[PDB]
Ligand binder design. Structure first.
Ligand SMILES: NC(=O)C1=CN([C@@H]2O[C@H](COP(=O)(O)OP(=O)(O)OC[C@H]3O[C@@H](n4cnc5c(N)ncnc54)[C@H](O)[C@@H]3O)[C@@H](O)[C@H]2O)C=CC1
Ligand SMILES: NC(=O)C1=CN([C@@H]2O[C@H](COP(=O)(O)OP(=O)(O)OC[C@H]3O[C@@H](n4cnc5c(N)ncnc54)[C@H](O)[C@@H]3O)[C@@H](O)[C@H]2O)C=CC1
Ligand SMILES: NC(=O)C1=CN([C@@H]2O[C@H](COP(=O)(O)OP(=O)(O)OC[C@H]3O[C@@H](n4cnc5c(N)ncnc54)[C@H](O)[C@@H]3O)[C@@H](O)[C@H]2O)C=CC1
Ligand SMILES: NC(=O)C1=CN([C@@H]2O[C@H](COP(=O)(O)OP(=O)(O)OC[C@H]3O[C@@H](n4cnc5c(N)ncnc54)[C@H](O)[C@@H]3O)[C@@H](O)[C@H]2O)C=CC1
Lengths: 287, 287, 287, 287
């Protein structure tokens, strides 16, 4: 009854962002998508052309309720951070108000205050290279777009959020244990994300009584992943063979857990890393 | 519909088992109480004399749904394990079928297969003494009743559970970090419980497609809690003052998380230790 | 000079207790062996018949320094705990002072106070069965001999130890992650051991200025290891193939880490679980 | 007998770098200091003026053996990374060869190959601000100088290192648990460092058979620390009051552990975070 969620990081219907949106729809939550400018127009085209129609069906006679879809780039905090190469870039020149702060004001101006925030984005320019061979520039780019973006989102959005609101982000187990092909500083970015989730829980909890948690999801071949060296193919094969639960991991499985963590049911949970991976993380030696 | 849960470890309405029952009732789950014999009669008397009527109110008038109340002692696996003294004891004399094997059979014969199991019990003869001064017998007593009981419950109940059923137990952070005052081997018992949860998730997951998780709750002033002499009032005060979320921790806060974990919405989560403690566990240095 | 260490849990030269003895000898530490009665005679016979001469060679000719070899059974805290059957058993009949309390007194009376204690023992009657099929008695048997023994050792030995003394035990990763094959409650016992190590570090640290840590070793083919039926050859093969350091893990590798932990050079380390497993524990997905 | 260690991050004699150097000297290890250019000249002056003479005394007639002292800035990987503001800067204009790669070649050119590397440096421009208020620039600066610098050091130094060499860095527990005044992204940087230590252990272990670990040290009021909001004063007071071991934590206590991790004694340890904090990290509730 008046629940609005902003999902930062959606480019298709095969990722976690979509799965999360589908489950949140069952609870009658109004959804607002944050779309990376470079793929915003194409996404909008597919949408208008009905290419996503079947993916929006939920339960019996119920369709996903998308309030709005806005261009959004997590690498720019404010208008001042926009450089020339970007302001002059073709894909961006046509858009406006895509920095984190501009989006929060835009959302607040059109729909009022929200109470659910989802950080579901990762980006590492050198994800194909192993950590040892990742450049300083690539490493920082990974931390900047995948980790700091979480902090910035919170800084600017708590202003347009209601007390007792909830925030979640997605992480991967490579931050705690070694996963050979998860390079480019992505493992580093996930390690910082998980630690920052704890520190943020303290600050947001004491100052605004807002909760924040992160979901350590299992493999799901998709947009990003598929750019990981391939790599995602093995992760899935291994997961489906050695995980305590031999069922297929769906985006809606992360979605339903996200839904719970964003509702008042989770009232007493904050600063945690919740594993939704069919229990794969508990194994040591594969049978 | 057709959701049946057996809660093992209820002696009154001031514990987690009760808060868990109320919350499950909100989702229309049929409840079956497993009550420790020493307090079975008192509990029932109070129930009949309507001393729990107020505590059974859920949602506008909706009253808790209790299907049955059975005498249950987690120390005995089968009738063969019951010693002469206990069998002749004044509070056990007129009771029957209270061992773990007998209760599984009784529930099966009377209601068919169930799909939700809650282990909400702990016991330690020497809890007032610190670990170093705990005797072998007291240590093993704590482990037997607090940890092994989970394993035994699983062994006998898996035969009367449907596939995709869910099982949860309750633990405390003293298993991972030092909490002076939590003696008698209770900390040892919790560590074993948390480890056994992972191992059982593997066995129960692969062989029966059944899940098992454990909830690490924050301090609650219950009978078991006060048994430690108070330690509990300190734990509660400290928690309400240093946790990132400064609010009173209610038994129903754990209850709602338990309902989520017992429902099919947590389908991809197993073998985990979920913290429901207002975030206290993430803190290192207070303020 | 004046460094005396009691090693509890030696039955031959193929285990960690031996590798630990050799390494301590390199630093001129006087060694006292605590041998399980069932194998006391065989061990001694072999020692006298010079069947260990080769294995006692440390550094150019320097030979191991064994101060004494005592019958020791970790199941008994005091002489009062010894049951009629064990007392009359063929291998215990002619032996005396083998309980934990009696050995502490004997060592004290004969050599004075010591300053180094090594708990290198484990036992589980039902180790061949998986956790789910382990009986209450077998579970408690595992916990009693493998975990409680550490606590008891501490209680009686703190009276005969100097301030700043050091204590170590050995654990295995199966306590934190699922290892199919490590049954009988051994995984449960290790989890309790690791948790008890932290709690005891608090008590022993504040009250006696004594330290206690535990080493989580990698796979070694010893008697206890082969008791599991082989599981061990698999663990070893897997380890030498997937660990970040591909080298054979030697008992003396654990020995040198044990010497460091037992010496005053580790003065500021206590209550910890130190992994000496060629790094295997940090891996998630193999290759 | 031919052991050389490079210590990156030394500005005075009151930090961990010095404590580590002192202990390494007892083992006859030749020491090479890496000094941040901005304070290189002042440091050199004090040295020449004998201001550090007393701090170099070790044991009886033994003085610390400093092979060399070179200007070193962990924020520049190669000569090409040097910008104008720096090349034109007064403090730098007078120096040359202070980038990571230049130092490795310089060291290799003068003294040959080394076998011990210590990363002991941290720097966060906004360490006084809480994480929520840290800018993107400050966050990345913290990760760049405190975390990436580890990766870069390894990349360029493995070339001048011998097989079986060892590397260590220093970290703090704020990466795992919340520490209110440890801001500026320093907690984030430590979280990434610890995770990267694992990934690097895998790559360095398999490719060059080189080990890498990190030491999670306890409070020690010093150069950096004292710039933390003060903050270090409380940390120490708390540590000395609630830690299991009530002794003062000295820089040489970290030193002796570092010494062990850098020697062949640690042969089987890699990718680990070793706590040297008098056990403070194991506590939950303070007595
Ligand atoms: N790929 C996988 O299987 C796993 C996914 N999750 C996490 O879930 C998140 C999304 O993963 P997927 O759904 O697989 O990926 P997608 O399905 O690739 O989602 C990532 C989104 O990030 C957006 N993005 C990239 N750079 C951006 C920028 N600068 N500003 C704004 N948006 C930007 C993309 O346009 C895209 O919609 C990531 O944080 C990932 O680490 C966690 C573990 C494994
Ligand atoms: N209250 C607290 O502070 C915390 C509670 N939880 C855990 O929740 C569970 C229950 O705790 P509370 O609700 O506080 O306690 P209660 O509220 O004391 O619940 C424990 C129940 O166990 C029953 N019981 C004891 N021995 C038994 C046996 N041999 N057979 C059958 N039933 C037996 C008692 O009769 C009682 O109803 C325990 O596992 C406890 O460790 C976890 C962390 C903290
Ligand atoms: N071998 C391995 O793969 C691993 C060994 N370690 C641990 O190292 C310790 C010893 O292991 P190993 O050297 O492999 O075994 P051994 O080499 O089998 O050492 C165990 C010793 O315990 C003694 N023992 C058993 N029950 C006893 C009792 N009641 N009283 C006195 N002594 C008793 C045996 O006689 C034997 O000498 C155990 O705690 C084990 O769990 C830890 C992880 C893996
Ligand atoms: N301060 C403390 O009590 C703690 C210290 N340790 C860790 O030990 C390390 C050093 O700490 P302390 O000895 O207290 O500090 P110092 O004693 O302040 O050592 C830090 C060194 O970093 C150097 N440095 C800064 N920026 C540099 C750059 N761009 N290039 C090259 N060198 C640079 C400084 O000149 C200084 O010598 C840090 O990584 C810190 O996090 C770990 C936990 C707590």
């Amino acid at each position: 009854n008046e629940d609005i969620c902003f999902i930062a990081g959606i480019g298709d219907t095969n990722g976690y962002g979509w799965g999360i949106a589908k489950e949140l729809s069952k609870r009658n939550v109004k959804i607002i998508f944050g779309i990376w400018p470079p793929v915003y127009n194409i996404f909008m085209k597919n949408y208008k052309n009905g290419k996503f129609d079947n993916d929006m069906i939920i339960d019996k006679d119920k369709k996903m309720n998308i309030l709005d879809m806005l261009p959004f780039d997590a690498s720019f905090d404010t208008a001042n951070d926009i450089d020339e190469e970007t302001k002059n870039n073709k894909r961006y020149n046509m858009l406006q108000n895509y920095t984190i702060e501009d989006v929060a004001n835009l959302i607040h101006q059109k729909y009022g205050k929200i109470n659910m925030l989802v950080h579901s984005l990762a980006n590492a320019k050198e994800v194909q290279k192993d950590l040892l061979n990742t450049s300083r520039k690539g490493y920082l780019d990974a931390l900047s777009k995948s980790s700091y973006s979480l902090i910035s989102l919170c800084k600017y959005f708590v202003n347009i959020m209601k007390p007792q609101s909830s925030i979640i982000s997605l992480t991967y187990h490579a931050s705690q244990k070694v996963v050979p092909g998860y390079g480019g500083g992505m493992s580093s970015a996930k390690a910082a994300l998980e630690s920052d989730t704890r520190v943020l829980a303290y600050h947001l909890g004491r100052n605004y009584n807002i909760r924040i948690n992160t979901i350590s999801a299992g493999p799901l071949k998709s947009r990003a992943a598929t750019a990981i060296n391939t790599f995602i193919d093995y992760a899935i094969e291994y997961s489906e063979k050695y995980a305590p639960l031999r069922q297929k991991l769906l985006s809606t499985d992360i979605g339903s857990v996200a839904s719970f963590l964003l509702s008042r049911e989770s009232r007493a949970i904050t600063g945690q890393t919740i594993y939704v991976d069919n229990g794969l993380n508990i194994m040591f030696l594969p049978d």
